[PDB]
């Protein structure tokens, strides 16, 4: 209790930012998104036209049907960063261990949180202050985000979080960088706020949090339609990364966890994993690399991937060494 319990204290660099080019990675936390309705994993809709080409062209990997630890953002989050997988995992324990951003923070790499969700549920706490910034409101209201004035509820949107990012990259430019945007993306119930208007597509939509009210239909309409606000979101993140050419770039997505969209009488999530609809778990997993990358996606488990992926592709990802992850299944593979 008193003091923190290690999982990392062997972790060493194998290759660091000064002996070969740097390594520039984005982390997308998604939200709510879940797989089936992901039109690169077979859904009737184009929800995910700007990804659906990257795939099709052979820019993006999808690795299908993933699961995530849990049905809730306040579980998955903290499990999502931990050494711990998801059966070992106790979501009221997670802030007394170092996570994997403790660990690549104490390595010397660049660690910075935007967050237009809510928080970065304890994932964060013993990094300075700085390093987590709130991208949920204006800056009038005490926040930083100048995108939040384009719809009549005054939301702030995820492509606020791209601005401006410049300057933190130029302030660690001799160094590993990793970047987590933590995304409003499809945060129910009231799907029809979390698109402006340019992704209105799918028609009609419900424009109620009484989703039981509605017809099954508009209220799918909507979900659709945040969607592909995400689909742009990325899209645009992608293009940032793309920029960057003075080092080596990942852009790697995946959603906290998936959402009942009326099956059975279900809607939304947070069901207990022992028995929750496999809607609520089933997310969808995107990985970008730069220009000439030096990494290469690893085969897919017999079993699929799952949200225990992650800290061993992070640690992969800047090089790091540890016990803690040894032999584990990771989305790219360990280098040299
Ligand atoms: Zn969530």
Redesign the pocket.
């Known amino acids: 209790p008193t003091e923190t319990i290690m999982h990392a204290n062997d972790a060493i660099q194998k290759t660091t930012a000064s002996t070969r080019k740097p390594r520039l990675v984005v982390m997308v936390v998604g ?2 998104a879940r797989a089936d309705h992901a039109s690169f994993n077979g859904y009737q809709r184009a929800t995910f036209p700007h990804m659906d080409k990257l795939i099709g062209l052979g820019q993006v990997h999808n690795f299908g049907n993933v699961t995530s630890c849990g049905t ?2 306040a579980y ?2 903290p499990c999502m960063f931990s050494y711990l997988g998801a059966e070992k995992y106790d979501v009221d324990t997670a802030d007394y261990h170092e996570n994997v951003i403790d660990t690549l923070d104490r390595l010397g790499v660049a660690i910075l949180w935007r967050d237009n ?1 809510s928080d970065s549920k304890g994932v964060m706490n013993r990094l300075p202050a700085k390093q987590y910034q709130d991208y949920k409101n204006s800056p009038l209201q005490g926040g930083n985000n100048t995108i939040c004035h384009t719809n009549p509820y005054d939301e702030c949107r995820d492509v606020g979080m791209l601005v401006d990012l410049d300057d933190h990259v130029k302030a660690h430019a001799n160094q590993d960088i990793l970047i987590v945007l933590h995304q409003m ?1 499809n ?1 129910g119930p009231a799907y029809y706020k979390r698109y402006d208007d340019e992704f209105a597509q799918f028609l009609p939509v419900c424009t109620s949090s009484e989703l039981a009210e509605c017809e099954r239909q508009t209220v799918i309409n909507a979900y659709d339609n945040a969607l592909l606000a995400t689909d742009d979101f990325l899209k645009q993140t992608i293009d940032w990364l793309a920029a960057q050419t003075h080092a080596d770039t990942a852009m790697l997505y995946l ?3 998936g959402e009942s969209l009326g099956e059975k009488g279900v809607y939304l ?1 947070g069901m207990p994993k022992a028995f929750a609809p496999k809607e609520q778990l089933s997310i969808p997993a995107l990985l970008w690399l730069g220009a000439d990358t030096p990494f290469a996606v690893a085969n897919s488990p017999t079993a699929g991937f799952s949200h225990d992926a992650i800290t061993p592709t992070l640690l992969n990802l800047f090089d790091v060494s540890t016990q803690a992850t040894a032999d584990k299944t990771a989305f790219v593979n360990p280098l040299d």
Do not use: C, F
Request: proline fraction near 0%; charged fraction near 15%.
């Open positions: 939200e709510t809730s953002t998955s989050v969700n993306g945060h959603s906290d966890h999530h």
